[PDB]
Structures are given as structure tokens and as C-alpha cells.
């Protein structure tokens, strides 16, 4: 039953379930869809779509495997663009960044909406107001543009940011975030090319744990 079922992780956690892991929700147009709730953070509810812990996992990608998803359950993983779009195409979904550096520092960002729009529109971000978190804000700079990978470039500059930059993200010229990165362990030389979130720690250092997150406002 798609009526009844629940649509997101908030419904989930209404009906009781508290601890986080994978469970079945039903997209707008009735297909069941796993996904990983959390439970945990913020007061949980949240239906986690990107998650980074430990470069087990390649993110440097193609259009394809952005818009079916790729990873493990178990770890790593893109929900993929489809999804994505499908999650957040109903109603107004709050978008949380939860950040993990090297030195076990916890640092979050808030939003207070998100949408991506389908694949005719590119996967485009539609972002809403920034309300907080000690991460800082590094996603307000690429509002309203288009999602790109290394072989699919709808950036706004006249290079290939997804090439440069080694990551898939919706790239303006450049970028202020990178959380599709490579996986660079901390401090590196390389110029914007790690998982990086420049408001808080620059352009020259790769966070541990990455996080991207939705729940109804
Ligand atoms: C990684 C990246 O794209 N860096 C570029 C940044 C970002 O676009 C930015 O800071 C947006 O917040 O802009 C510059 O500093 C700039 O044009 O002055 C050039 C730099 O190469
Ligand atoms: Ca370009």
C-alpha cells in the first residue's frame, strides 16, 4: 500500500522506529525505494542521500552512475539523482551537512529548504535560506545551477570543474563546496580538490565523514 506507506524517514520515525538503518519508503509516484534513515542527529527523521567515511568508495563518476546511485548500504554511497529528485520533489525538505574532520571535530549546516529538479533540468539545485551550523555556509553559492560530472558538463564557467576538481557537484565556477571530492585524508597540497567545505576549513582540506540529509520543514 503506497497511501499508506511512508514517503520519508520522518514518517518513519513517527511511526516508531529509532534507530537509524535502511527501510522502505514509497516515492511520489509509487515506487518503493531503501534508504538510509537517521534517527540520531537533530532529532532524526532525516533520509541521508550522500554519505563519505572512509574512500572505500570512488565518487569521481560518471552522469550514469550520479543518476542511478553507486556505493554500499554498509558504507559510502550516492543515492543517486533520480532519487534525489523524487525525495524532495514533495513538499519543502529542510537540508542538513553534517562535517567530520581528522581531529574529531563535529560541524553541521543547516538549510531551510532544498530541492533538485529532474533530469530534463539538469538535477538543478533549488536551495532555501541558510539558518545556521559551525560549518559555516559554502552551498548558497551554487544555488540554481545545474548539477554536473566529468562527462556531463552544465557548469557555469568555461572549463570543466568536474574535471578539474576531480568530483561531481553543482558546479558554478567553481565551486565553494566539494563533498563528491576525492577522498584526501585531512591536509592537502592540491588545490580544491578534496572534500572540502571552504566556509569552515578552506580549500585545502578533506573532511573524514560527509553527510547530506533531508526532512520535511
Ligand atoms: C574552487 C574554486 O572554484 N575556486 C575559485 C573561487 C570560487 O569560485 C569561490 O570562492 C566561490 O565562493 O573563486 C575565485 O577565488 C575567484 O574567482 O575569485 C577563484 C577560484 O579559482
Ligand atoms: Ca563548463
Partial sequence: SCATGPRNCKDLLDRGYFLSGWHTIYLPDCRPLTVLCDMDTDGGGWTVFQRRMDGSVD???????????????????????????????????????????????????????????????????????????????????????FFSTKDQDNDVSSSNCAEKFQGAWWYADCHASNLNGLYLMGPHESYANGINWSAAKGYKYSYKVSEMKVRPA
Avoid at 533520480?82 to 553534517?98: M, V
Avoid at 529538479?117 to 559554502?138: C, I, P, Q, R
Fill in 59 to 145: 565518487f569521481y563518476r560518471d552522469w550514469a552512475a550520479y543518476k542511478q546511485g553507486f556505493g554500499s548500504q554498509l558504507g559510502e554511497f550516492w543515492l543517486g539523482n533520480d532519487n534525489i529528485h523524487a525525495l524532495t520533489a514533495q513538499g519543502s525538505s529542510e537540508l542538513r551537512t553534517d562535517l567530520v574532520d581528522f581531529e574529531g571535530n563535529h560541524q553541521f549546516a543547516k538549510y531551510k529548504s532544498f530541492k533538485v529538479a529532474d533530469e530534463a533540468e539538469k538535477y538543478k539545485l533549488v536551495l532555501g535560506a541558510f539558518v545556521g551550523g559551525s560549518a559555516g555556509n559554502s552551498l548558497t553559492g551554487h544555488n540554481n545551477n
